[PDB]
Design brief:
part of a larger assembly, 4 chains, 452 residues, Aspartate Aminotransferase, domain 2, 2 domains, 17 helices, 39% helix, globular, selenium (chain B), PyrdxlP-dep_Trfase_major (chain B)
Chain lengths: 452, 395, 91, 91
């Protein structure tokens, strides 16, 4: 059996077989791994044929060269999908980013005075205009935006917050857990389901530095539930002389009813003009932008946050900073259809079917495919609109050979990969999240899975 | 027509860097290779598996994509990455020394950028700061002498944006490790430059410290900016002992620092490059390693372009400048500048007009002689250089 | 009541580490209340009842469940399919 | 020397603010030492002397300069162009 093991070619000849075919460093890493697999499989007497070797060393090389991070075709019909990378970006944006990234830029440079300048300065003008707050600022993501506003304003002093608003969004962000590290002392009023105004007013004192309110972004309570009207927090503040801090979290830039979707989701503009002192929110949710914590409110307060020596550990990168100005530009130009998360949520019911059947039309020929189109009510906003229930057309599919489960699994390993809903051994594809250029990619994906 | 031009344009614009300073704090530090920017463009274009593990079909950690690259290039046990280096320090402190003492050389309490100051951040870090030695000189005894029950951390900062000459003494790195393994205290080096490999391999002879080397010396933790000598997007980079990384990771503040989708991907590509030894493809490595001949080569191809433009006095000089801005304070290398002068207009007014061009160009002034260092200039800029000057001077 | 109240986890989510985390010399009671007249949807996590018991039998702490519904029997046995908790089963 | 040492600013940079910031009831002395046997180049900031004196005349605190080089007269008079301070001028 050592003559069946001596048939394995040495590392140098594999090097020779693929010379310019693939980088020299990968191919050696692909022969060493496949040679330990054939040395162990023939010793244990599990392999009589070595012909799969030439093909297998090539697969490793293809694989060993591939990004862990890859574009993926979202079929779940979830617009803000925390796992799949929240708000994707319009080509215009990406180009504007591409360009600023290909060389040097006036990032920290004021051309007028020919002297360094704050990088936050480029954006803030847009923010002050869209929101109508006195001043504004930007840090890495909303997470740190909370952390900043607490540690700036309330280190060692009391922050009163509703017991119903202490959220855990994502895997490691938790308002109580961070607020602690913030250094602020956390006073929780009311109870889970209910919290009247009196609960806030009642825990105020000399040590009370902040009246915070967090928006329940990724959940919701129904049944006996009360909540305190924003107009009432502000009045309570202006009575005792205490600033109010609202974490919108969704970072909704405008009124959302203007687009035909009727929800109460709060937005910067509207929240500011209500008289709140501070408001925050992520840039990669309902804004439609790249990832960023966005703080707007009273000048005296921003200056304070700016001056805080942690602001420098949160300060945004060149990429998010640029992409964010291009995406705020859009908003001034009422170019809403250009920022993906807005267009996907505001699409015509008609639009949806239209794409639904154009796909159906692409899967008729493919062998063993059971294709039907149904009208379902699903819930589009994952990380910012929990209750939102909107109608959307899904192309439910099923193959007699393979079961729905295996199908998902393979769809996630395709190139590109496709992730989508499962429901009663009926793979589903919500067209809310699907771009048109994918439809061709989908059909070419399926025809290659079932006919191979 | 001029209002239309301005009424349409972004506050942030690309700028042509003639200063010959590769890591230029003001002009946006390390600029990015097209391959990378296309990898970034692709992942931002739609949805992607950022927080999603495809194998298990459940949520996963977005820092998992990269840490494989860092573990291999440095040699450390595990790794992690946060917004920038600023926070990479602030995280290591609040993580490993909240409420306990950190020992650090009085020579190494730095003020880098306008708002960052190790004494001002480390404070907000919650760690108690114990400063040994003196400005100019610091021996090993100074470090050892201030150890005690509260001493959680031995920190050494690299003076990135300054240097001391004259009578000056520094504590050797091998020394601070010995001192650590003696008392059972962890060692934390802020490289800042975030130099990923030995720099002498490319012909530039300096002592700048790098991860691979700093790690195999036995330091427990090492950090650094990604957008400096690494040549990538803005990132705080942390490599070292596994037990420590896991502690940092679990820190609830690490979520307020977790890196964005753009910089995450763009980093994977930048790291992929490094594994493929494609060094010439990462801007800040090629620029600093260009052949002296290569620079003249570019200097006179430009002078050939401006000989026609009216009133232009063009000469090529060979001058010694200091390329590294935010990472290499002492470095001094030879490069060819195309010094220009216009009879009508003076050097100062010239800069001014050049900064207002589209694109704008920023450069050095020395004795009423405008200067263009070619170390930082891209080939496609040369055509745009000539087209912007002839528009200012024949208008 | 005179009891000293120690509130673990967060509104929407609460793991088992949260309970176990706050245990100490003073901790006399592991209590769970059932959300009778409301409910949360979205990203939500709750601590399994089998788990609270394992935890208490670990440190020698009593568990106390306020059903509130006070459902007396298994309700699925009548064709209505819900998870409402009941005395027999909880004990 | 028995004195209590209050170290304001950072290695490379020090503004006036840093000085004024650490003043108090127990502050008996504003001291400036001339860096005689070394020097910093790069990003580097220092407090102009006039500023320290102003700051002294403000709170009523004595200023103390250790020149060290102890240079009696202006050196520029001899053709050497250097900023080295001297007693006369410093007084």
């Amino acid at each position: 059996m050592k003559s069946l093991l001596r048939q394995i070619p040495q590392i140098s000849k594999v090097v020779e077989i693929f010379a310019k075919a693939y980088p020299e460093i990968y191919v050696v890493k692909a022969a060493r791994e496949v040679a330990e697999k054939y040395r162990k499989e023939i010793i244990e007497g599990a392999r009589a044929d070595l012909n799969g070797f030439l093909e297998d060393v090539e697969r490793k090389i293809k694989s060993l060269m591939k990004p862990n991070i890859k574009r993926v075709i979202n079929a779940t019909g979830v617009v803000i999908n925390t796992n799949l990378g929240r708000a994707p970006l319009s080509k215009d944006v990406i180009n504007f980013i591409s360009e600023i990234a290909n060389g040097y830029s006036n990032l920290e440079y004021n051309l007028e005075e020919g002297k360094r300048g704050s990088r936050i300065a480029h954006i803030e003008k847009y923010l002050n205009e869209l929101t109508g707050a006195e001043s504004s600022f930007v840090v890495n993501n909303n997470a740190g935006a909370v952390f900043l506003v607490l540690n700036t304003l309330a280190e060692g002093k009391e922050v009163i917050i509703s017991r119903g608003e202490l959220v855990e969004i994502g895997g490691s962000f938790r308002i109580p857990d961070i607020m602690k590290k913030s250094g602020a002392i956390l006073r929780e009023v009311g109870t889970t389901n209910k919290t009247k105004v009196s609960d806030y007013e009642g825990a105020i004192n000399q040590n009370t530095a902040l009246l915070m309110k967090v928006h329940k972004s990724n959940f919701y309570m129904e049944g006996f539930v009360e909540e305190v009207k924003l107009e009432d927090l502000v009045k309570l503040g202006h009575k005792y002389g205490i600033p109010t801090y609202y974490d919108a979290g969704s970072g909704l830039l405008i009124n959302l009813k203007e687009f035909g979707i009727s929800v109460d989701e709060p937005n910067f503009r509207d929240c500011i003009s209500l008289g709140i002192d501070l408001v925050s929110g992520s840039g990669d949710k309902l804004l439609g932008g790249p990832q960023a914590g966005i703080i707007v409110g009273k000048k005296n307060l921003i200056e304070k946050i700016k001056k805080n020596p942690i602001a420098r550990a949160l300060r945004i990168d060149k990429l998010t900073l640029s992409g964010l100005e291009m995406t705020l530009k859009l908003y001034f130009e009422k170019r809403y259809e250009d920022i993906p998360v807005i267009r996907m949520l505001t699409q015509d019911e008609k639009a949806l079917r239209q794409k639904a059947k154009r796909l159906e039309k692409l899967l008729k020929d493919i062998p063993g495919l059971k294709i039907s189109v149904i009208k379902d009510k699903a819930k589009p906003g994952g990380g910012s609109l929990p209750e939102l229930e909107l109608p959307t057309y899904c192309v439910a599919i099923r193959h007699d050979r393979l079961s729905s489960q295996e199908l998902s699994r393979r769809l996630r390993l395709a190139e590109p990969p496709i992730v989508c809903r499962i429901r009663e051994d009926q793979l589903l594809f919500d067209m809310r999240t699907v771009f048109h250029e994918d439809l061709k990619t989908i059909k070419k994906t399926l025809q290659e899975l079932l006919s191979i």
